Structure 1
Amino acid sequence: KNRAARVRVSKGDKPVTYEEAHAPHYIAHRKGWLSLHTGNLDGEDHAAERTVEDVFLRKFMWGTFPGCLADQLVLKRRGNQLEICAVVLRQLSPHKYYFLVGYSETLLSYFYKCPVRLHLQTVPSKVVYKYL
């Protein structure tokens, strides 16, 4: 049987998100892409460096906002800029969110040598597409 990126069915008590409920054969039919850049276009270059940056960013933000991310990130590149768009929860205090936005935006700008901006969208609880 096929297993990649499939959430196995259960009794019906397991909540899943939209992206987590669709398998790889829906990536351009019912889903989009979580990262958007020009590396993988015909005749373009540096698709390997943009991928290592993505893998590190998804882990930096998972451990920098522990237990706060409601759904996967969305990385966006427009030339030199790097836009991180995240959906987070409302448990943490806003005082601490503003601290981490400025700490991460700055730390990552000096690491990757590019202007970095972070966009949060708070939701009360993790959105549920269906129950498996």
Structure 2
Amino acid sequence: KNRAARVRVSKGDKPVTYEEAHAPHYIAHRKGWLSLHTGNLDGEDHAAERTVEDVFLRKFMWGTFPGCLADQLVLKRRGNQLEICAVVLRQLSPHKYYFLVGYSETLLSYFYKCPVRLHLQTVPSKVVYKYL
């Protein structure tokens, strides 16, 4: 049987998100892409460096906002800019969010040598697409 990126059915008590409920054969039919850049286009270059930056960002943000991320990130590149769009929870205090936004935006700008901006969208609870 196939296993990649599939959430196995259960009794019915397990909540899943939209992206987590669709398998790889829906990535261009019912889902989009979590990262958007030009590396993988025909005739373009530096697709390998853009991938290592993505892998590091998803981990930097998972450990920098522990227990706060409601769903996967959405990385966007428009020229020199790098826009990180995240959906976070409302448990943490806003004072601590503004601290981490300025700490991460700055640390990542000096690391990758690019202007970085972070966009948060708070939700009360993790959105549920269905129950498996």
TM-score normalised to structure 2 length: 1.00
Paired with 2:110 and 2:25, the residues of 1 have a C-alpha distance of 38
Q: CA deviation at 1:97?
A: 0.1
Q: CA deviation at 1:104?
A: 0.0
Paired with 1:30 and 1:20, the residues of 2 have a C-alpha distance of 12
User: How many equivalent residue pairs?
Assistant: 132
User: What is the RMSD computed on CA atoms of the aligned residues?
Assistant: 0.1
Paired with 1:130 and 1:29, the residues of 2 have a C-alpha distance of 19
Q: CA deviation at 1:29?
A: 0.1
Percent pairwise identity: 100
Partner of 1:128: 128
Which 4+ runs in 1 deviate beyond 2 A?
Answer: none
Q: 5+ unaligned residues in a row in structure 2: which ranges?
A: none
Q: Is the partner of 1:86 in helix, strand or coil?
A: strand
Paired with 2:80 and 2:89, the residues of 1 have a C-alpha distance of 29
Q: CA deviation at 1:46?
A: 0.1
**2:54 is equivalent to residue 54 of structure 1:** yes
Q: CA deviation at 1:7?
A: 0.0
Paired with 1:58 and 1:5, the residues of 2 have a C-alpha distance of 17
Q: CA deviation at 1:50?
A: 0.1
Q: What do residues 70-107 of structure 1 show as CA deviations (whole Å, max 9, x unaligned)?
A: 00000000000000000000000000000000000000
Q: CA deviation at 1:28?
A: 0.1
Q: CA deviation at 1:124?
A: 0.1
Partner of 2:97: 97
Q: CA deviation at 1:30?
A: 0.2
Q: CA deviation at 1:44?
A: 0.1
Q: 5+ unaligned residues in a row in structure 1: which ranges?
A: none
Partner of 2:14: 14
TM-score normalised to structure 1 length: 1.00
